[PDB]
Design a protein around this motif. Sequence first.
Motif, mmCIF file in Angstrom:
data_model
loop_
_atom_site.group_PDB
_atom_site.id
_atom_site.type_symbol
_atom_site.label_atom_id
_atom_site.label_comp_id
_atom_site.label_asym_id
_atom_site.label_seq_id
_atom_site.Cartn_x
_atom_site.Cartn_y
_atom_site.Cartn_z
ATOM 1 N N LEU A 22 -34.607 40.523 12.389
ATOM 2 C CA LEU A 22 -34.063 39.178 12.449
ATOM 3 C C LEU A 22 -35.252 38.217 12.555
ATOM 4 C CD1 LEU A 22 -31.586 37.312 12.306
ATOM 5 C CD2 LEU A 22 -31.414 37.421 14.772
ATOM 6 N N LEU A 25 -37.053 37.985 9.200
ATOM 7 C CA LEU A 25 -36.273 37.187 8.197
ATOM 8 C C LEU A 25 -36.317 35.717 8.516
ATOM 9 C CD1 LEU A 25 -33.167 39.394 7.851
ATOM 10 C CD2 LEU A 25 -35.063 39.112 6.223
ATOM 11 N N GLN A 26 -36.185 35.339 9.773
ATOM 12 C CA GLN A 26 -36.170 33.984 10.104
ATOM 13 C C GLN A 26 -37.528 33.324 9.905
ATOM 14 O OE1 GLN A 26 -34.164 33.048 13.843
ATOM 15 N NE2 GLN A 26 -33.951 30.973 13.196
ATOM 16 N N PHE A 56 -28.512 31.776 11.596
ATOM 17 C CA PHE A 56 -29.334 32.702 12.386
ATOM 18 C C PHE A 56 -28.984 32.699 13.901
ATOM 19 C CE2 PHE A 56 -32.776 32.400 9.015
ATOM 20 C CZ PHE A 56 -32.647 33.694 8.553
ATOM 21 N N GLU A 75 -26.781 43.206 7.508
ATOM 22 C CA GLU A 75 -26.991 42.675 6.108
ATOM 23 C C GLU A 75 -25.853 41.824 5.580
ATOM 24 O OE1 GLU A 75 -29.796 45.923 4.003
ATOM 25 O OE2 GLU A 75 -27.704 46.435 4.182
ATOM 26 N N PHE A 78 -26.409 38.411 7.011
ATOM 27 C CA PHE A 78 -27.531 37.741 6.321
ATOM 28 C C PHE A 78 -27.163 37.260 4.906
ATOM 29 C CE2 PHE A 78 -31.569 38.184 3.790
ATOM 30 C CZ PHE A 78 -32.178 37.080 4.341
ATOM 31 N N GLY A 106 -36.692 38.109 2.041
ATOM 32 C CA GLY A 106 -35.952 38.956 2.944
ATOM 33 C C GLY A 106 -35.667 40.339 2.378
#
Length: 121
Positions: A22, A25-26, A56, A75, A78, A106
Amino acid sequence: SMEQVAMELRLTELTRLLRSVLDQLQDKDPARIFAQPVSLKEVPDYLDHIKHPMDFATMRKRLEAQGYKNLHEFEEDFDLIIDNCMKYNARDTVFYRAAVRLRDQGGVVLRQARREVDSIG
């Protein structure tokens, strides 16, 4: 039971790995476009368009309650962030383009997360 404890430990370790995913990705969203839920005060029509909003902060809440049982679930959330944005916003916008870049970057992270989840079990 001890079997229940072992399952709980596996969920905890998955949670640790998903927290690191996480974060990674962020970091691919340095504008923080996807950080918080779309405000219905500021976009009052949003839920007419988008049926399952995601962001998020909402994912982090779910994660901290150990609410993702597997990588597929994580996933899914996301992909909602990206897909929702690419529907509501047009191609020529900074929002859409941010979503494309988040998806592309990502993908890299998620490809290795899957290997790690399968590998460690």
